[PDB]
Design a protein around this ligand. Structure first.
Ligand SMILES: Nc1ncnc2c1ncn2[C@@H]1O[C@H](COP(=O)(O)OP(=O)(O)OP(O)(O)=S)[C@@H](O)[C@H]1O
Ligand SMILES: [Mg+2]
Lengths: 97, 138, 49
DNA sequence: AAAAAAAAAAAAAAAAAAAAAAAAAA
DNA sequence: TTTTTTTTTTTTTTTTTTTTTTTTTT
């Protein structure tokens, strides 16, 4: 995803993943994240890091197969962001597994 | 219950003392969890909601609240359950048709998209009520 | 972002979520004007509105 | 017209649980 | 070099206390 240096916008239908992208950015900076803040107006937080890295979609149902989780077992995740000022360029990143 | 059985063995006074004291203590402190769990009948159950597919009968998702959802999901779930509960709570509680049918929504569709609003209106009309809407020029 | 009077910020990006959810046209316009006034790069999120 | 009993909401505090970072040992 | 142990800080939950208003009786 790219950002024009003169102000951009993000749009999309409901339940698409916009706040997922914004939280993936927010994780790299603050000391202790408050995930999914704007949904409740600014009073509580709901998600957690492991939930993101394993990609759980909805609370699901009972059973034992746990089909409501995407990745099971060994996994690798990487996040990176880029800042440019003038010629010089910096990258911030994290690797989890 | 335990105390009771001990009394059945005594047929001597301390069992009666303990049982009466337990009951008297339960009478007080009605704002604590134990008293609610012991006397109020409605506190002896647990509730949950489930989503079931139309054709057939299959559990697809079980929920105890509205946690972990996105923006529109919380709004639609809350509105749906509240309007269903209100529709039941009126006259059709004891059957017959409602005598006072109207419902007021404030800041309608402050966070949802077009399709969600369409579903909301469709469900609200299907429940058989009359609505008044309050929105800015959004 | 600038503790002293030296100005010249190094970080200049702001992020908003569900912007303009409970306001009319004039309010949004004034918010945008005020945000641009300080000289800050901005990002916006909106459910197609 | 004035005095007393009752009930619902707001606020402070104590107890409990959990996760991250440094020190120490095989 | 790898592993275990310990401490520290942050968050949530439940209990109790306090206050204001309403209704009734004299
Ligand atoms: N921890 C989680 N628990 C449950 N469902 C989740 C979780 N993380 C992601 N999801 C799902 O992933 C979807 C992605 O949507 P989100 O990014 O959360 O919200 P959105 O796409 O930004 O829509 P909005 O209302 O504009 S914020 C959600 O709607 C959920 O169904
Ligand atoms: Mg969220």
């Amino acid at each position: 995803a790219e950002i024009d240096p003169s102000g951009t916008a993000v749009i999309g239908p409901t339940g698409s993943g916009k706040t997922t992208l914004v939280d993936a950015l927010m994780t790299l900076l603050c000391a202790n994240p408050r995930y999914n803040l704007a949904s409740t107006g600014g009073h509580e937080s709901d998600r957690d890091l492991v939930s993101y890295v394993r990609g759980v979609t909805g609370p699901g149902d009972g059973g034992v197969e746990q089909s409501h989780i995407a990745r099971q077992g060994k996994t690798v995740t990487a996040i990176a962001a880029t800042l440019e000022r003038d010629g010089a360029q910096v990258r911030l990143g994290a690797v989890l597994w | 219950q335990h105390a009771q059985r001990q009394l059945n063995s005594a047929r001597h006074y301390k069992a009666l003392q303990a049982l009466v004291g337990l009951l008297k203590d339960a009478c007080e402190h009605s704002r604590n969890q134990g008293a609610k769990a012991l006397l109020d009948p409605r506190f002896r159950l647990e509730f949950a909601v489930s989503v079931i597919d139309r054709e057939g009968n299959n559990l697809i998702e079980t929920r105890t609240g509205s946690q972990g959802g996105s923006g529109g999901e919380k709004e639609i779930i809350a509105s749906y359950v509240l309007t269903a509960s209100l529709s039941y709570a009126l006259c059709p509680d004891g059957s017959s048709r409602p005598l006072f049918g109207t419902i007021v929504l404030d800041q309608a569709f402050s966070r949802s998209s077009h399709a969600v609003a369409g579903r909301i209106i469709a469900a609200l009309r299907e429940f058989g009520l009359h609505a008044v809407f309050i929105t800015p020029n959004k």
